[PDB]
Design a protein around this ligand. Structure first.
Ligand SMILES: [Ca+2]
Length: 219
């Protein structure tokens, strides 16, 4: 059901320091090649009074290139799909939590994202829009119980680095649990290299285009 070319649709509802918003978007890519693009539109609550960059990594791990010796847990979860839950802890105290549901309907992926950002300084780089994109990341993947029910799924850990407009970087520690909706064979531990780029945007970041490349490899 996962073709060499696949489209997706995404909707995000969220709030950051109490500012509520909604985003709708579409994307496409080559799931076995590890490449994808997305175009997002702020449909409620725009222009956003915070950095787009804290949202960009929440808009698609079915598009990770895996070698044949790493079981592709998230691709194998389809057509039913998978869920993921994420916590990002930023170095100045900010917190972002996310829940996501991924399914396959009528030939395209459907992504439903819920996001809450809290504990951000009112004068910090996120609420003042003083960031300019993510450095490349390496996510450490490993089997484990992330939702506390005693049964293993797939976990990921990342140290992410956000570029600051004034120079230097703003770090976040990220933990994600990925849960297939049906029993799927789990891989052993491995690493995924990821780069997410903002490829275009309008003046107030109410229309934004993204490009991501991701590839798994042995540790
Ligand atoms: Ca579990």
């Amino acid at each position: 059901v996962i073709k060499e070319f696949m489209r997706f649709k995404v909707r995000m509802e969220g709030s950051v320091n109490g500012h509520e918003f909604e985003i709708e978007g579409e994307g496409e890519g080559r799931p076995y090649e590890g490449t994808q693009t997305a175009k997002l539109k702020v449909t409620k609550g725009g222009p956003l009074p915070f950095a787009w960059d804290i949202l960009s990594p929440q808009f698609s791990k079915a598009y990770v290139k895996h070698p044949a010796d790493i079981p592709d847990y998230l691709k194998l979860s389809f057509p039913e799909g998978f869920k993921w839950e994420r916590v990002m802890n930023f170095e100045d105290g900010g917190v972002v939590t996310v829940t996501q549901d991924s399914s396959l309907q009528d030939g395209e992926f459907i992504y439903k994202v819920k996001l809450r950002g809290t504990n951000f300084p009112s004068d910090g780089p996120v609420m003042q829009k003083k960031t300019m994109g993510w450095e490349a990341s390496t996510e450490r993947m490993y089997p484990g119980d992330g939702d506390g029910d005693g049964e293993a799924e797939l976990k990921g850990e990342i140290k992410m680095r956000l570029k600051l407009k004034d120079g230097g970087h703003y770090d976040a520690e990220v933990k994600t649990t990925y849960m297939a909706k049906k029993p799927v064979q789990l891989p052993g531990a491995y690493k995924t290299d990821i780069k997410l780029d903002i490829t275009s945007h309008n003046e107030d970041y109410t229309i934004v285009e993204q490009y991501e490349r991701a590839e798994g490899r042995h540790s």
